[PDB]
Design a protein around this nucleic acid. Structure first.
Lengths: 86, 81, 95, 81, 73, 77, 74, 275, 201
RNA sequence: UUUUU
RNA sequence: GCAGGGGAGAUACCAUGAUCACGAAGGUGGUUUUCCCAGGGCGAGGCUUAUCCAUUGCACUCCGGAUGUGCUGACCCCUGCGAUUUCCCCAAAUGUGGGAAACUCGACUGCAUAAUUUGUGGUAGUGGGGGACUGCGUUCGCGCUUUCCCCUG
């Protein structure tokens, strides 16, 4: 499991089955693909039914989030881990 | 088992089409027994969404619906073990 | 249950005698087969390899579906790997 | 017991939130969480998919119908993580 | 196969949510590790306002979303 | 503590007409005498009938074997 | 009568014609060929029927475990 | 089975968990059998047995007088459903713990003493150093034995190491649930290695490579060879660490007519009572 | 964290709850299926009968050639054995003389032992009329076998029954009867037969 | 050894 | 609960000095070699961005020096790993190593593990918007419904 250990504590944006994307620091994982996100922010695209406009993103801070692997679809590297050096 | 044949597909450029219509084309760097595929430099085209390039992309085995291999893949040699 | 030991040689007899023989003949006789999946598509092609979970490896497969008047569409793939979870039914080509 | 399962076990006794598979979200004091993510809550505030809110004295949510769980930040200060 | 914590809800009147947007209410006489429950004096609680009594019934745990205790355990 | 397995065994021994709803489908249900059951909750019924909510008609099929995954909630009568 | 479990009922249904209805609404009527421990179905000279009416005849068809909803005789 | 529902065989922890979670009731219970009450007190289940007896109805308990010890007792036995509760406690000895348990749960019991594995089995205990007898184990296995055999060990881990050593020695060794006992009874497993903790038939050979710290555990190990019929052979490897039981083993050397040892009887640490 | 003081439990405080937001997806039982799944009964156009791929186009990798080479080597060994069986004749060989029924064979003997010590060991059971040791034709080394033909068959039988397993020059030698000209259908170890089980597996 | 499968 | 610590072929060379008139083939235990190759050591070379020193330079074949984060990475080596205990031997004889085991922990793998609680689908992927083109209610913003052509996943 070196490919999953290489992305440890990084800002990963995991895409859910419902289309939402949660970006956060992946703190822990398991064999059932359950992820632990630190300071997670959830965003989702809303289809504009009123007129032809841009897609609306609705973000929300959850903090320590425990996501099930059954609801997880895909996850990519979005940002670096929070570095302590200046 | 058939997961052993997919586990030998490391560094091969495949196209994983998901059940939600998302199609990710890229070189799979790793595969597991639970059909999870980790790929590098992938291009993802979701349903009603624009494609995007990523340096790394992990897909679970439950969300993967189909996998398109290259035509020059040795399917006869890879099925021996 | 039936085989608690480390000898699981009855799986080959079940794949040669049970419903999986309809797949196992398709690897043996190299006959075509049409498989309808959960994605509203029908893929016609040859079965090269399969497993107990019905995960198949197809060569020279053609998947046909119907979008929108219902307009039929088709797409050919020289080598594909179909998961056994998304497969709904499969039937060998009558000849 | 996995590390998310350990975090869910250590998150019991405090107020946590849990989003249901049907679209509801219940926030309350987690009484007991099992290995299969089945969580019992006491005096929880639930919110349906329409947006209406209600109060429940005792509730139990199965782990098979649990989408996500929101834990306090002190669980990030675990010695495992 | 860890069993659920339905010992506090044993022989207690509780309301559970079904899979297809339905609900039920009754005394949970027992439990299963697959979350299968036995309801006594069960209520139908359909989409209409009127409900029906079924008495003893068995509910599968794959179709049970959440159970709310009406007797406060 | 009454168990659902012992209740299903008592219903099969008493041959009561059990009606079970479908999983993820609120339109059709299956009613009939539970002739037998299995470990995987599969029910074999001697006279099964599918009843729809909209058409309000019961179409009989006979001795039918239903999987345990389709069963969601089974009551008597 | 004896309490008929689904496994001897499916064994007696093997060789005899049976109709299996799926969860997707489609049904298949034909001679039951073989079954396994996961209650998979094999059929020979089967006919596929959609929405009650017969849609066509396929032949030998393998019906999976998770897709099959119910199965009855004739 | 609980939903199915005349008598119930339980462990004190499992019965306490069933009674505490309201999974089983004792409203119709009128008979309490306590097999191996000394082993229940030694396992720490005596407060668990007290908590299980606290859930019993006190209105069905027998009075503690001369009527409980036979015309009025037979008349109470003939009462049917209106009978008082009865208690039958079976054990290997009489400690003060099992005596207090019989005083609390039972009312004026009658004592029936049989049941003596040290007197009915040839105690071929090897008084020679247990380590030397440990090497003699391989010699005892090469000398021939009748399957199944028992290998008693102070600790389960050692027992597992002895089972792995017997498996490396070209013998089918079982470790100690029901699958090992069925293999031992059917003839597959020839030696089952376990601790001083059943379901076992008469065995021809009982090998105690690790000597127990008490004579009751040695008697319980010797009782696995059979209460009647075949006496069997109980070979126990004696060491310097079991000398505080060796005087008790001298009693095992005293009351054994079926056994012929000078090393254990004339031992300096086994000549006086310990303590 | 459960059995914790409230000073330590105050660090374990929950954050703000999430705001109310509608779900992105609807219910699966209440979804609008505009075009659901259907069968493949109109979709039967896969292949005709004469324009079909052949069955047997399947093979292993790097094992079939090795198996064919092993089969060819086994066939060559069997042909060599069948050729050697036709030219082998103990009744037409000059080394095999005398009465076969009264001649014993001593095998597994030491190479350092001479014929005189073997004759002295075999003369205890009776008079030996002839002794013939086996030596290599090219190298000249003894093969560890010898034939002792006695004048009486009873002496040969007593030597076979009594000197079997005797230690000669530090090595236990085997004593048997002559089966080359007395046993029907007998074959040596070079012709795919012979006795002994020292190298069975 | 003595539910927590 | 259970079992385990690289597999599949040729070995021509060595040992097993093969029980029949000079042999066996082959297997087994070593050596070499080909694939599936796995975890590492050596880090040459190359990419990215900052700090300091020097350079006012006439090129059209990239190219001043040192350090730091993040990476990639050929050639060359080993057949497994981190911890314990015993016997024998080469030995620069209390060190360095070689050959064997006893087996424990780090949740390493497979297993009635594709049958209701994550690793074989009731989470399908069946759209969104612009022009003409219907009907109902109307607060005239719209909720539902009936069409064709376009841009887009």
């Amino acid at each position: 499991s070196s490919k999953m250990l290489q992305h440890i504590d990084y800002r990963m944006r995991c895409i859910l089955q419902d289309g939402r994307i949660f970006i956060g620091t992946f703190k822990a994982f398991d064999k059932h693909m359950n992820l632990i996100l630190c300071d997670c922010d959830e965003f989702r695209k809303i289809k504009p039914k009123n007129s032809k406009q841009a897609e609306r993103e609705e973000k929300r801070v959850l903090g320590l989030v425990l996501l099930r692997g059954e609801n997880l679809v895909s996850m990519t590297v979005e940002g670096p881990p929070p570095k302590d050096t200046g | 088992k058939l997961v052993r044949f997919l586990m030998k597909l490391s560094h091969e450029t495949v196209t994983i089409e998901l059940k939600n219509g998302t199609q990710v084309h890229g070189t799979i760097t790793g595969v597991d027994v639970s059909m999870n595929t980790h790929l590098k430099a992938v291009k993802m085209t979701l349903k009603n969404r624009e494609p995007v390039q990523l340096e790394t992309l992990s897909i679970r085995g439950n969300n993967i619906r189909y996998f398109i291999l290259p035509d020059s893949l040795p399917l006869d040699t890879l099925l021996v073990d | 249950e039936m085989t608690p030991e480390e000898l699981q040689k009855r799986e080959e007899e079940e794949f040669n005698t049970g419903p999986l023989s309809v797949l196992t003949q398709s690897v043996k006789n190299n006959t075509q087969v049409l498989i309808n999946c959960r994605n509203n598509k029908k893929l016609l092609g040859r079965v090269k390899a399969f497993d107990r979970h019905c995960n198949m490896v197809l060569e020279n497969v053609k998947e046909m579906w119907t979008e929108v008047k219902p307009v039929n569409k088709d797409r050919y793939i020289s080598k594909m790997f179909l998961r056994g979870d998304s497969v709904i039914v499969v039937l060998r080509n009558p000849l | 017991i996995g590390v998310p399962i350990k975090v869910l076990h250590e998150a019991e006794g405090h107020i946590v939130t849990c989003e249901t598979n049907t679209g509801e979200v219940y926030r309350g004091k987690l009484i007991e969480a099992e290995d299969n993510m089945n969580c019992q809550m006491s005096n929880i505030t639930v919110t349906y998919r329409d947006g209406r809110v209600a109060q429940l004295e005792q509730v139990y949510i199965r782990g098979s119908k649990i989408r996500f769980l929101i834990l306090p930040d002190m669980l990030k200060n675990a010695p495992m993580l | 196969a860890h069993p659920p914590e339905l010992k506090k809800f044993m022989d207690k009147k509780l309301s559970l949510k079904l899979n297809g947007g339905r609900h039920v209410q009754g005394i949970l006489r027992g439990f299963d590790p697959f979350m299968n429950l036995v309801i006594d004096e069960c209520v139908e609680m359909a989409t209409s306002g009127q409900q029906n009594n079924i008495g003893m019934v068995v509910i599968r745990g794959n179709s049970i979303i959440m159970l709310e205790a009406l007797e406060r355990v | 503590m009454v168990q659902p397995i012992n209740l299903i065994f008592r219903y099969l021994q008493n041959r009561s007409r059990i009606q079970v709803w479908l999983y993820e489908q609120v339109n059709m249900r299956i009613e009939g005498c539970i002739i037998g059951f299995d470990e995987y909750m599969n029910l074999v019924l001697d006279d099964a009938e599918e009843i729809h909510s909209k058409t309000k008609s019961r179409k009989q099929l006979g001795r039918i074997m239903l999987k345990g995954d389709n069963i969601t909630l089974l009551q008597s009568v | 009568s004896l309490p008929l479990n689904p496994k001897p009922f499916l064994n007696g249904l093997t060789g005899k014609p049976v109709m299996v209805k799926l969860k997707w609404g489609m049904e298949y009527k034909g001679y039951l060929v073989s079954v396994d421990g996961y209650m998979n179905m094999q059929l020979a000279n089967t006919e596929e029927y959609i929405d009650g009416a017969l849609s066509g005849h396929l032949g030998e068809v393998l019906i999976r475990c998770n897709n099959v909803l119910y199965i009855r005789g004739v | 089975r609980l939903r199915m529902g005349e008598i119930v065989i339980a462990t004190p922890g499992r019965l306490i968990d069933v009674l505490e979670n309201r999974y089983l009731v004792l409203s119709r219970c009128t008979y309490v059998v306590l097999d191996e009450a000394d082993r229940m007190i030694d396992m720490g289940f005596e407060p668990d047995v007290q908590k299980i007896l606290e859930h019993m109805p006190v209105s069905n308990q027998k009075p503690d007088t001369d009527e409980a010890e036979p015309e009025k007792m037979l008349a109470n036995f003939e009462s049917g459903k209106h009978k008082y509760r009865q208690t039958v406690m079976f054990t290997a000895t009489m400690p003060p713990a099992v005596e207090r348990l019989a005083r609390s749960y039972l009312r004026r019991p009658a004592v029936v003493y049989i049941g003596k594995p040290h007197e009915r089995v040839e105690q071929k205990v090897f008084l020679m150093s247990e380590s030397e007898k440990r090497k003699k184990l391989l010699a005892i296995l090469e000398q021939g034995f009748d399957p199944p055999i028992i290998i008693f060990v102070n600790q389960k881990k050692g027992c597992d190491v002895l089972a792995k050593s017997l498996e490396k020695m070209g013998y089918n060794a079982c470790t100690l649930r029901e699958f090992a006992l069925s293999n031992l009874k059917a003839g597959a497993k020839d030696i089952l290695v376990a601790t001083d903790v059943i379901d076992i038939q008469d065995v021809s050979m009982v090998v105690n490579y690790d000597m127990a710290k008490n004579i009751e555990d040695y008697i319980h190990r010797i009782g696995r060879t059979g209460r009647a019929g075949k006496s069997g052979v109980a070979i126990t490897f004696l060491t310097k660490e079991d000398s505080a039981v060796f005087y008790e083993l001298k009693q095992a050397i005293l009351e054994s007519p079926v056994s012929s040892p000078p090393e254990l009887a004339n031992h300096p640490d086994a000549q006086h009572k310990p303590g | 964290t459960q059995f914790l003081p409230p000073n330590l439990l105050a660090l374990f405080a929950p954050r703000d709850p999430i705001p109310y937001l509608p779900p992105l997806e609807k219910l699966p039982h209440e979804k609008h299926h505009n075009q659901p799944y259907c069968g493949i009964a109109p979709y039967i156009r896969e292949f005709e009968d004469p324009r079909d791929a052949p069955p047997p186009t399947r093979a292993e990798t790097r094992e079939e050639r090795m198996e064919r080479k092993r089969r060819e080597k086994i066939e060559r060994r069997q042909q060599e054995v069948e050729t050697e069986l036709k030219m082998w004749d103990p009744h037409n060989d000059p080394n095999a003389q005398g009465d076969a029924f009264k001649t014993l064979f001593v095998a597994r003997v030491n190479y350092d032992t001479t014929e005189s010590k073997l004759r002295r060991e075999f003369e205890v059971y009776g008079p030996i009329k002839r002794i013939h040791m086996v030596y290599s034709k090219r190298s000249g080394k003894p093969r560890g076998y010898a034939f002792i033909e006695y004048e009486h068959e009873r002496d040969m039988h007593s030597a076979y029954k009594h000197a079997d397993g005797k230690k000669i020059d530090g090595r236990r030698v085997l004593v048997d009867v002559e089966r080359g000209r007395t046993v029907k259908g007998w074959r040596p170890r070079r012709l795919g037969g012979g006795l002994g089980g020292t190298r069975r597996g």
